[PDB]
Amino acid sequence: PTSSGSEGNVKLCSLEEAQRIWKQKSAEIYPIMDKSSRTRLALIICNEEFDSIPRRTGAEVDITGMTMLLQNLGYSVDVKKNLTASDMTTELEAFAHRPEHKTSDSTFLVFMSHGIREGICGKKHSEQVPDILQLNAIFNMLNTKNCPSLKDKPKVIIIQACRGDSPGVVWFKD
């Protein structure tokens, strides 16, 4: 039991358990491409330093952890930092156009920033002049029309961001 391999700290699926899973509901599992030839891609967009919002100290720990995890799972990881919403849109359109998706079976996109109810904050965001990327735009840029190379393939979007100012709790009597 060693974390020395490419998978690091991710526990491995034995080929025993793999064919156990693959025979119990095979018609309902996404197919995996051959490890020797597949070209999986992932994209991490992280905003830590903002023009008018407090810095997200600790963000570098998040980048490190998600980058290593996604590499452990077999993805080649692009990391982009401190982007406006327009920059984020441009990076997503470029990612959707990557030729590797054709020889990939799946993708992960990770977004880490400040957020408000409406979406994810760009580098220059303020309530004076909002700089927001909506989740709806992310889906549209990766869907079958705008990213045909990922048709029928799982697209996993992870978002670390506040969604408002509320604490998310209510009191009840014990």
């Binding site: 491995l12 889906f139 697209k155 996993v156 670390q160």
Partner: protein
């Protein structure tokens, strides 16, 4: 010949809190949701599909701790189980 495909399919999104609500980040240890997601992926990618792993992350947040948050999966059009088969 041309054929029709669903325009939106095989997506899952996983957000760090519920709508209107904050997510927490430790200034030197990183975001709570990110660290918890990594731990769960590391432990369960070998045995559980991604939707089930996200559910387990949700469960791990179930009791508040002064800094409560509830991760939410959104806009799910996965038609199959997504197993990562780590090592293959």
């Amino acid at each position: 010949a041309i054929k029709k495909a669903h325009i939106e399919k095989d997506f899952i999104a996983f957000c760090s809190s519920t709508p209107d609500n904050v997510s927490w980040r430790h200034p030197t240890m990183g975001s709570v949701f990110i660290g918890r997601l990594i731990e769960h992926m590391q432990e369960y990618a070998c045995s559980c599909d991604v939707e089930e792993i996200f559910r387990k992350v949700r469960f791990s947040f179930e009791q508040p701790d002064g800094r409560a948050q509830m991760p939410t999966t959104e806009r799910v059009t996965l038609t199959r189980c997504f197993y990562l088969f780590p090592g293959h």
